[PDB]
Copies of this chain bind each other. A is one copy, B any other.
Amino acid sequence: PGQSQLFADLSREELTAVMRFLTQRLGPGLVDAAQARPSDNCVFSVELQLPPKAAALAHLDRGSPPPAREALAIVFFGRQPQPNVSELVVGPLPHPSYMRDVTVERHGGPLPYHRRPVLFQEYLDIDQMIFNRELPQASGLLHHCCFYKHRGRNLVTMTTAPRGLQSGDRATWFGLYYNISGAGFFLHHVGLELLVNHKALDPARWTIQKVFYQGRYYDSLAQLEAQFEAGLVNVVLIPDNGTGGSWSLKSPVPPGPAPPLQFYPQGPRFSVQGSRVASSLWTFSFGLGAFSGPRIFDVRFQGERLVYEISLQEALAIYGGNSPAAMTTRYVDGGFGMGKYTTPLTRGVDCPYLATYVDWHFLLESQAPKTIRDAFCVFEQNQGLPLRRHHSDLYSHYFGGLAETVLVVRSMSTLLNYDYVWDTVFHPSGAIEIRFYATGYISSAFLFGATGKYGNQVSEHTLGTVHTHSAHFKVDLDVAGLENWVWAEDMVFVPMAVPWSPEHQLQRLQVTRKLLEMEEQAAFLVGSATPRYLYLASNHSNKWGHPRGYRIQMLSFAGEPLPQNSSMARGFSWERYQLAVTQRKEEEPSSSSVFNQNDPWAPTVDFSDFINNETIAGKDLVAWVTAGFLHIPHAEDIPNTVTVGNGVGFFLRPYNFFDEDPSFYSADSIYFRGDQDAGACEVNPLACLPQAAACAPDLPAFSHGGFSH
């Protein structure tokens, strides 16, 4: 009816077109982001502006004309007497002709300039101040401890956390580490940690305001030499070569027989075309925000839409430690960007070999579109489980089952050391499983002092620092329509007398159903009682009279939220909740904000604002889910944290939404009575895989979508 693809990310043309539009009317002194100074004017990002929902649905459902495709741009305006970041909407694509400043509309005033993310340039300007005007003042020490030459670069920095202690601060603790080659630098901290202040717009004005060496705090790298020279510093010598997991990543073992391989014996059974995937049961668009990360829209099971949007909103990591970097590190990874940092998927490792892979395009900190090759994979997996089965020996004498095969969509953000895997998986039953693994390397500190309270030793000199991971997701169900209710069902035992034997007691198992009517009644804090059955449902009912529902079951071992006493906790208020449900809104598009990380004491978005007692009885509702877990690192996280058991997320499960299990109708289901031949091709499809069905494809030659330079 409405056949447009209005959820798709911008093409290169589209991106270019918007850049050209902007170039022209920003004007006096627009610099390329990739070399911008603080005092420059800069285009930080250009990406899709999502359509408003009312119009989108009108188009898709009621055949109306589609809304204007627009793009949003972030502009650092540094070349003024009162710098600002600005958000600018630009359309209508593909040939734009207007531009609108929506900053004060969305934020209520101008964006203070320090909120802006640190630029690639800014990182380089810092690393010069470090390696040219600072480390030099301590070649004595460094020649001694850390194999340092002239200046040379054998070391390497890495950033942290918020940057400072107050709204307004821009001061980052940087750890120093050996530039290892072909493997992870994060394990090889050298015990040096500089607190670089960089608020000023003139990099010359940038001071170092504290030093930390191997357990001790000094006021500068001068003092540090003074003492080292004065023999007054006991210095630990940390190697820069080694062998095994803390050094390498290459398995020293030769390839053995081949892992199992999965193929689609007579062609695939889904198809991807643009941002749009379609299979016999399922239909959806998939995307990728620069900063939010992955998203799917307009999901439909057999024609019927369940969810308008499911989308990553934020990712969080909270550290402890001995040493000022980690003890103060609260990463709000959106402020770097889960899209911006998405990475190629290595065919046969990150997804099955025959997955279909799909490029992503972007214009970030640049002036022309680039592309991450193979950023998404989509594939149909045979789970090795049945979805359902029943064997009957009792009375008759039949078998009926179906092997679960499933449809997956994956992307991976790789930020610093972390490799986040994001999955969404679509089940034949009509259920949707969201999963989030964390792999890759481990951020580490130099092992020194009271360890046990702050992690485990994992390699020599190497503390695996304790941290919590948490992720937030937006789940905008539209259960059989916009207007939804949320219900809480649970159990209870009521002690009673056996009706037919009143001497005796029995414990009466009962169901309990309560209707949650206000936003607060459906806001569940971490470590609180949570209804065993929580679902959103329609006013409409199914064929047996029960409300049509989708149940949210969580899979989270959430750590313990940063205490609310912390003046920075407003910057990730969503961590306090397991689950919340809120009235959907155009002014509440996101949980978080790329600007939250560099000023969480004065948040651009405070998710707790969304919970503001309003009815959730029969409105357009959106459910916000938090998933996460505490990580105390240990030896088996070397070289990499492994995915097994680190999976975390939620199901969306149909609860009296249908009138019966859709999989009853699967083409793949199997059935035979005891009185039949089950090794008969006409009774049973599986009887005729061997002769003569399907002959295993020739494989694409391997290839890889490479690295950023």
Tell me if A346 counts as interface (CB < 8 A to partner B): yes
Look across to chain B and name the residue whose beta carbon is closest to the beta carbon of A557: B532
How far is A437 from B670 in the complex, measured between Cα atoms in Å?
19
Tell me if A313 counts as interface (CB < 8 A to partner B): no
A401 touches B346 (CB 8 A): yes
B346 touches A399 (CB 8 A): yes
27 A-B pairs (CB sep. < 8 Å): A179-B395, A182-B673, A210-B500, A217-B500, A250-B400, A251-B664, A251-B667, A254-B667, A255-B668, A258-B689, A261-B262, A261-B263, A262-B262, A263-B696, A350-B401, A351-B384, A352-B382, A388-B440, A388-B641, A388-B642, A390-B440, A468-B491, A495-B563, A555-B555, A634-B656, A638-B661, A645-B651
B457 touches A664 (CB 8 A): no
CB within 8 Å for A669 and B259 given contacts A391-B344, A394-B416, A510-B454: no
B251 touches A389 (CB 8 A): no
Partner among B259, B457, B630 whose Cβ is within 8 Å of the Cβ of A491: B630
CB within 8 Å for A431 and B644 given contacts A389-B350, A509-B319, A639-B660: yes
Give me the 6 closest cross-chain CB pairs, A-B, nearest first: A249-B400, A320-B509, A251-B669, A245-B660, A256-B667, A690-B699
Look across to chain B and name the residue whose beta carbon is closest to the beta carbon of A347: B686
A260 touches B256 (CB 8 A): no
Q: Which residues of B contact A351 (CB under 8 A)?
A: 384
Query: Which residues of chain A from 389 to 437 have a CB within 8 Å of any chain B CB?
Result: 389-405, 408, 412, 414, 416-417, 419, 421, 423, 427, 429-431, 433, 437
CB within 8 Å for A694 and B380 given contacts A563-B507, A639-B660, A671-B250: no
A507 shortest CB reach to chain B, Å: 5
A253 touches B665 (CB 8 A): yes
Look across to chain B and name the residue whose beta carbon is closest to the beta carbon of A492: B560
Partner among B182, B532, B559, B707 whose Cβ is within 8 Å of the Cβ of A630: B532
B349 touches A389 (CB 8 A): yes
- For A144-165 the 0/1 string (1 means CB < 8 A from B) is 0000000000001000000001
Q: Which residues of B contact A391 (CB under 8 A)?
A: 343-344, 346, 412, 414, 419, 707
Tell me if A64 counts as interface (CB < 8 A to partner B): no
**Copies of this chain, count:** 2
Interface range for A: 35 or more
B643 touches A386 (CB 8 A): yes
Tell me if A590 counts as interface (CB < 8 A to partner B): no
How far is A665 from B529 in the complex, measured between Cα atoms in Å?
42
CB within 8 Å for A437 and B385 given contacts A253-B669, A651-B644: yes
Tell me if A505 counts as interface (CB < 8 A to partner B): yes
Partner among B346, B382, B500, B667 whose Cβ is within 8 Å of the Cβ of A262: B382
Mark the stretch among A135-143, A538-546, A575-583 that contacts chain B.
A538-546
Mark the stretch among A7-15, A49-57, A221-229, A265-273 that contacts chain B.
A265-273
Tell me if A185 counts as interface (CB < 8 A to partner B): yes
Tell me if A97 counts as interface (CB < 8 A to partner B): no
B644 touches A261 (CB 8 A): no
Q: Which residues of B contact A337 (CB under 8 A)?
A: none
B704 touches A693 (CB 8 A): no
Tell me if A220 counts as interface (CB < 8 A to partner B): no
Tell me if A441 counts as interface (CB < 8 A to partner B): yes
B260 touches A267 (CB 8 A): no
Look across to chain B and name the residue whose beta carbon is closest to the beta carbon of A269: B257
Look across to chain B and name the residue whose beta carbon is closest to the beta carbon of A245: B660
Mark the stretch among A31-39, A613-621, A677-685 that contacts chain B.
A677-685
Q: Which residues of B contact A382 (CB under 8 A)?
A: 259-262, 352
How far is A351 from B403 in the complex, measured between Cα atoms in Å?
8
For the A-B complex with A348-B686, A430-B636 known, give 20 more contacts whose Cβ atoms are closer than 8 Å.
A244-B664, A250-B400, A251-B665, A253-B666, A258-B689, A258-B694, A259-B269, A349-B401, A352-B403, A385-B643, A393-B707, A397-B707, A455-B511, A457-B546, A495-B563, A532-B630, A542-B635, A636-B661, A690-B700, A693-B696
B657 touches A636 (CB 8 A): yes
